[PDB]
Design an enzyme around this catalytic site. Structure first.
Site, PDB file in Angstrom:
ATOM      1  N   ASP A 436     -55.282  37.503  -4.096  1.00  0.00           N
ATOM      2  CA  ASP A 436     -56.018  38.357  -5.152  1.00  0.00           C
ATOM      3  C   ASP A 436     -55.340  39.352  -5.583  1.00  0.00           C
ATOM      4  O   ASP A 436     -55.002  40.353  -4.627  1.00  0.00           O
ATOM      5  CB  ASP A 436     -57.469  38.143  -4.837  1.00  0.00           C
ATOM      6  CG  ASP A 436     -57.628  38.930  -3.145  1.00  0.00           C
ATOM      7  OD1 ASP A 436     -56.699  38.803  -2.534  1.00  0.00           O
ATOM      8  OD2 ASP A 436     -58.769  38.841  -2.788  1.00  0.00           O
ATOM      9  N   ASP A 741     -60.116  40.255   0.949  1.00  0.00           N
ATOM     10  CA  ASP A 741     -61.041  41.531   1.596  1.00  0.00           C
ATOM     11  C   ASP A 741     -62.540  41.674   1.223  1.00  0.00           C
ATOM     12  O   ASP A 741     -63.211  42.327   1.741  1.00  0.00           O
ATOM     13  CB  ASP A 741     -60.216  42.626   1.004  1.00  0.00           C
ATOM     14  CG  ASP A 741     -60.289  42.969  -0.346  1.00  0.00           C
ATOM     15  OD1 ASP A 741     -60.308  42.146  -1.201  1.00  0.00           O
ATOM     16  OD2 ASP A 741     -60.436  44.446  -0.424  1.00  0.00           O
ATOM     17  N   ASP A 745     -65.544  35.464  -0.979  1.00  0.00           N
ATOM     18  CA  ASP A 745     -64.740  34.240  -0.555  1.00  0.00           C
ATOM     19  C   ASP A 745     -64.907  33.960   0.924  1.00  0.00           C
ATOM     20  O   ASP A 745     -64.057  33.189   1.272  1.00  0.00           O
ATOM     21  CB  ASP A 745     -63.150  34.615  -0.794  1.00  0.00           C
ATOM     22  CG  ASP A 745     -62.872  35.981  -0.181  1.00  0.00           C
ATOM     23  OD1 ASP A 745     -63.595  36.460   0.341  1.00  0.00           O
ATOM     24  OD2 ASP A 745     -61.685  36.441  -0.110  1.00  0.00           O
TER      25      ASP A 745
HETATM   26  F1  ALF Z   1     -59.780  40.234  -6.833  1.00  0.00           F
HETATM   27 AL1  ALF Z   1     -60.528  39.644  -5.406  1.00  0.00          AL
HETATM   28  F2  ALF Z   1     -61.341  39.140  -3.651  1.00  0.00           F
HETATM   29  F3  ALF Z   1     -60.211  41.264  -4.529  1.00  0.00           F
HETATM   30  F4  ALF Z   1     -60.817  38.251  -6.085  1.00  0.00           F
HETATM   31 MG   LIG Z   2     -60.200  40.623  -2.531  1.00  0.00          MG
END
Ligand code: ALF
Ligand SMILES: [Mg+2]
Length: 1031
Positions: A436, A741, A745
């Site tokens: 991500d 992070d 998710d």
């Molecule tokens: F952009 Al993310 F978990 F940090 F989808």
């Molecule tokens: Mg993330």
């Protein structure tokens, strides 16, 4: 996949309880095919509406679940108009996959609970909830249930039975019980203590995981409900039901449950659902359309667990809001509810068939004692069981445990602080990783490079630009990250006015008198200053470039500001205008004193532009390059806009092939997906979108496997769809690495076999691995550690199998005449040689060089099996040759074959066999570990060579000099002759032969020759890739 329901109520007392008690002992078969078990209990045939034990029929389903209905305290079509008001004739409900299921008398069936979207509730009857009505509140609380996430405690009494019955857990207990019959207590205790310690550790870890999962989710807050009368009272968050009027405080925090706005607007800070932290404006919902599907109105519905920054009041006592989703069916509940309940055989059947063949090979030979020997009068029962259980070692699962815990400790030394050793062997076979852009791939903070237009390092230009830039900070730095970074970039330090003085200006400071407030409707932040530096003060205001450009008609207007803005928007840049307007000291004093905004904002003049960039970590590019060098495909998943994600991926520099995106169109029952560009076939990679990914789930006419294989970048991915994507990817026997992070998710991380979390909280609770570093450089290290662990486990398994086979064959050959290899000799062979060798051969790690070949994912390769068979035939042949040589040679005294018991241990037959077989284990231990390709060079790691040399030296000494260890051990003195020289020569020739065989087989030279040309298609991806590559 449809399903049904059936059951019947409990029967009367009588023979039914007798038969139920009978089923206590023979329930060992209840694990498989529970239909017989359920039909053998108090489950007669009855009506479909008077059922109590609800079970799932075998309607294209396997492993049906079982549940018990919950009793109701008291008993007494418009698409669920809300059939639930008041007390009905009969009320029954049960728990299944989170949200409970209610019973409707009119439908005569169990209707799955769905929100008003499914029922097509018109908006005419909505927008009229002014608090709780005269209807009983407890009815809604009872039917919907408490607004709390229920997680089972799973205490010891209800946890041991669930995770104490494994295939290699009952056989070990049987072997342990066997030892008590025929002495040998020393070995049993060693296995028993380690098994008990492992069981206790597993139980403690499971209890800790359950406790931390339960404590992670909890609601403790007081909310305000606007009553229909003239008073308001505070109520807890555990009694929230749909249709209640919710009041949002001006300084509210988290959102206990989903709600819909009806008057006013309030800022939101969605962080647990979307990676981007940009506030989103959520206004009221004035509409008069038909059914409200709750899908096209994402701009007016607040999601659970969302922080509120600022709220604007409207006409009336305060703002009004309504509750439309709560409980387990809300956004937060759905993600959590998808983790608790919800989570080939060919090789298994081959292995079990081989084990059965091995067992039946010795099952008939053992009973043949009556032919060539005298029966021990019913003492072979213990011997037969010992021979049956000696075919495999009871510590086989524990053989790899030492390697697993050593690898876990090595990882814990630096980098990843592992909590429990598991899922390490399978982690080496990694071929895809998900990343991500926000959180780990790019820095959270926003950095400003400077001002591009003038009509590079800071402090270069001279003029009012520096004052305008350094004075635009409406809020003092000290008595959001972008403001801090902006003030740090200029190099100045900040901390008539109390604490509003500027430093680093050679002249007297420019002090801001008053700071205008921020409002949702107006995006203007003006600052007025006045200083005695003999210069007319100036006013600086910031806002959207479009508004300032439009309202700057009286003054000079910008030129060529459209194409640049479009390009910046397409590249992910954010454009903000810096307007200004000079004002003399005297009018400025009055403007500041009287708080005038209309007069100062009438005319302005832009001075420069400011933009922000992600500022990705420099260390990311080398890591990505190294990962891609190993034929690993990298995929990006994020909830941010596709425009930013695509440009971030392009700027990564990993590769620049043809790139196209699918354009979303108007809703339609049938949807077509066209192509795009940055008919001639090329190496273009597929790239889907948010709505398209969720629309393709319902129907997949084609392009289902061909899309995920080439999928490169995914944008605007919903938290719930990540789990579906992971499941779809894993359906092809593939390993997916989920890295993130945030808390959006957790389900994907749990579903993924291997995942890494860069946050100490949230994801750390559910993620198998927790990383203490904010860099993605740990993935190659984890992959290398997993590959090394898998190789070490394979080597240990091969060594254990070889040792077990050698022991079994040595016992079988001796079984021809009355012998048992003694007791002390067997104890030494088991405890000493095995323990000291297995542990010391699994303490090596990968080097600093990353290869390309990946280890086999299963122990079914033909080369290893062929090598093992060759070694077995060689060892048995040399043993038979030695036995024939020592039998033909004329020895001192014939063996006493009268007593069929281990009382005649001192003899020449046992001494020549035990010593000869002892060296075999050591010889094979040093010829089963791989060197250059995966493990570190053997010579460098020398804790084990010294131990092996000492063991060989002591064995040679005890087998050469009489009286060294022949007293306690069952050994017999042998006259000094040339037999020792012949035995040493045989050992040396066998050693050199085995080493040569290992060296020649390691190169796998015949593998390529045999690979010409049997087509291999044992994969679900290579077969389709070959067809795709044709054109
Ligand atoms: F952009 Al993310 F978990 F940090 F989808
Ligand atoms: Mg993330």
């Amino acid at each position: 996949r449809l399903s049904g329901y059936c059951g019947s109520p409990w029967r009367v007392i009588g023979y039914h309880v007798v038969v139920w008690m009978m089923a206590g002992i023979p329930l060992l078969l209840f694990r498989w095919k529970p239909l017989w078990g359920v039909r053998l209990r108090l489950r007669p045939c009855n009506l479909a509406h008077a059922e109590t034990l609800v079970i799932e029929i075998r309607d294209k389903e396997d492993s049906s679940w079982q549940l018990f209905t919950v009793q109701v305290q008291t008993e007494a079509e418009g698409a669920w108009k809300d059939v639930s008001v008041g007390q009905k004739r009969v009320l029954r409900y049960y728990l299944f996959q989170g949200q409970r299921y209610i019973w409707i008398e009119t439908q005569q069936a169990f209707y799955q609970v769905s929100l008003l979207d499914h029922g097509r509730s018109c908006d005419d009857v909505h927008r009229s909830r002014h608090g709780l009505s005269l209807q009983d509140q407890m009815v809604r609380k009872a039917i919907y249930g408490p607004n709390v996430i229920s997680i089972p405690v799973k205490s010891y009494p209800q946890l041991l039975v669930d995770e104490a019955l494994n295939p290699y857990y009952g056989f070990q207990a049987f072997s342990i019980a066997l030892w008590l019959a025929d002495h040998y207590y020393w070995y049993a205790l060693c296995i028993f203590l380690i098994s008990s310690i492992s069981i206790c550790l597993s139980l403690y870890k499971t209890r800790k995981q359950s406790q931390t999962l339960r404590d992670m989710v909890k609601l403790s807050m007081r909310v305000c409900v606007c009553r229909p009368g003239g008073e308001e009272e505070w109520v807890d968050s555990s009694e929230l039901v749909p249709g209640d009027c919710l009041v949002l405080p001006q300084e509210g925090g988290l959102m206990p449950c989903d709600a819909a706005l009806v008057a006013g607007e309030c800022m939101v800070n969605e962080s647990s659902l979307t990676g981007e932290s940009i506030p989103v404006l959520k206004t009221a919902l004035p509409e008069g359309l038909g059914p409200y599907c709750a899908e096209t109105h994402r701009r007016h519905t607040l999601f659970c667990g969302t922080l509120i920054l600022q709220a604007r009041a409207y006409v009336g006592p305060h703002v009004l809001a309504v509750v439309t989703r709560t409980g387990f069916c809300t956004a937060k509940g759905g993600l959590v509810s998808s983790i608790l309940h919800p989570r080939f055989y060919k090789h298994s059947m081959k292995f079990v068939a081989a084990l059965s063949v091995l067992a039946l090979l010795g099952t008939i030979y053992s009973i043949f004692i009556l032919y060539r020997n005298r029966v021990p009068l019913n003492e072979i029962v213990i011997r037969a069981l010992d021979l049956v259980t000696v075919v495999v070692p009871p510590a086989l699962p524990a053989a790899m445990t030492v390697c697993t815990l050593y690898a876990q400790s090595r990882l814990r030394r630096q980098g990843i602080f592992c909590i429990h050793p598991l899922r390490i062997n399978l982690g080496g076979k990694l071929q895809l990783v998900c990343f991500d852009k926000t959180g780990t791939l790019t820095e959270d903070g926003l950095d400003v490079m400077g001002v591009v237009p003038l009509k590079e390092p800071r402090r270069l230009p001279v003029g009012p630009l520096l004052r305008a830039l350094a004075t635009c900070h409406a809020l003092s730095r000290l008595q959001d990250p972008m403001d801090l970074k902006m003030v740090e970039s200029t190099g100045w330090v900040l901390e008539w006015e109390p604490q509003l003085q500027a430093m680093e200006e050679p002249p007297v400071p420019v002090s801001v008198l008053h700071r205008f407030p921020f409002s949702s409707a107006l995006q203007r932040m003006s600052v007025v200053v006045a200083w005695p530096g003999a210069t007319q003060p100036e006013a600086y205001v910031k806002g959207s470039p479009e508004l300032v450009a439009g309202l700057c008609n009286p003054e000079t207007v910008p030129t060529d500001f459209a194409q640049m803005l479009q390009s910046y928007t397409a590249a992910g840049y954010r454009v903000v205008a810096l307007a200004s307007k000079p004002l003399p000291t005297v009018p400025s004093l009055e403007a500041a004193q009287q708080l005038t905004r209309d007069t100062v904002e009438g005319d302005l003049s832009l001075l420069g532009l400011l933009v922000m960039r992600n500022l990705l970590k420099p260390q990311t590019t080398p890591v990505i390059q190294a990962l891609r060098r190993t034929r690993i495909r990298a995929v990006m998943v994020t909830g941010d806009n596709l425009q930013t994600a695509v440009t971030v991926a392009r700027g990564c520099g990993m590769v620049a092939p043809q790139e196209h995106l699918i354009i979303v169109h108007a809703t339609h029952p049938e949807r077509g997906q066209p192509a795009s560009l940055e008919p001639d076939p090329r190496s273009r990679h597929l790239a889907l979108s948010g709505p398209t990914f969720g629309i393709i789930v319902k129907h997949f006419p084609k392009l289902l496997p061909k899309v995920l294989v080439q999928g490169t970048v995914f944008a605007r991915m919903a938290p719930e769809q990540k789990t579906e994507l992971v499941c779809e990817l894993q359906k092809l026997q593939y390993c997916v690495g989920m890295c993130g992070d945030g808390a959006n998710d957790c389900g994907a991380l749990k579903a993924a076999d291997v995942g890494i979390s860069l946050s100490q909280a949230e994801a750390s609770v559910v993620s198998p691995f927790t990383s203490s570093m904010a860099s993605i450089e740990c993935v190659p290290m984890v992959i290398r550690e997993g590959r090394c662990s898998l190789d070490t486990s394979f080597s240990v398994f091969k060594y254990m199998a070889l040792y077990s086979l050698t022991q079994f064959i040595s016992v079988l050959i001796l079984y021809t005449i009355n012998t048992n290899l003694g007791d002390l000799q067997f104890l030494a062979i088991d405890l000493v040689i095995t323990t000291t060798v297995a542990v010391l051969m699994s303490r090596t790690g990968p080097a600093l060089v990353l290869g390309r070949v990946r280890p086999p994912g299963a122990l079914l390769s033909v080369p290893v099996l062929s090598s093992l068979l060759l070694q077995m035939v060689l060892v048995t042949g040399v043993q038979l040759g030695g036995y024939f040589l020592t039998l033909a040679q004329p020895w001192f005294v014939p063996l006493n074959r009268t007593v069929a018991a281990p009382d005649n241990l001192p003899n020449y037959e046992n001494t020549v066999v035990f010593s000869l077989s002892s060296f075999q284990y050591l010889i094979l231990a040093a010829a089963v570990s791989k060197g250059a390709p995966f493990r570190r060079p053997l010579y460098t790691n020398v804790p084990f060579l010294v131990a092996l040399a000492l063991l060989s030296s002591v064995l040679v000494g005890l087998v050469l000099v009489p009286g060294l260890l022949q007293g306690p051990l069952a050994l017999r003195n042998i006259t000094d002759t040339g037999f020792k020289l012949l035995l040493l020569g045989l050992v040396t020739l066998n050693f050199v032969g085995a080493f040569m065989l290992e060296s020649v087989l390691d190169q796998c030279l015949p593998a390529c020759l045999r690979r010409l040309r049997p087509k291999r298609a044992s994969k679900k991806r290579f077969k389709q890739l070959e067809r795709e590559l044709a054109e």
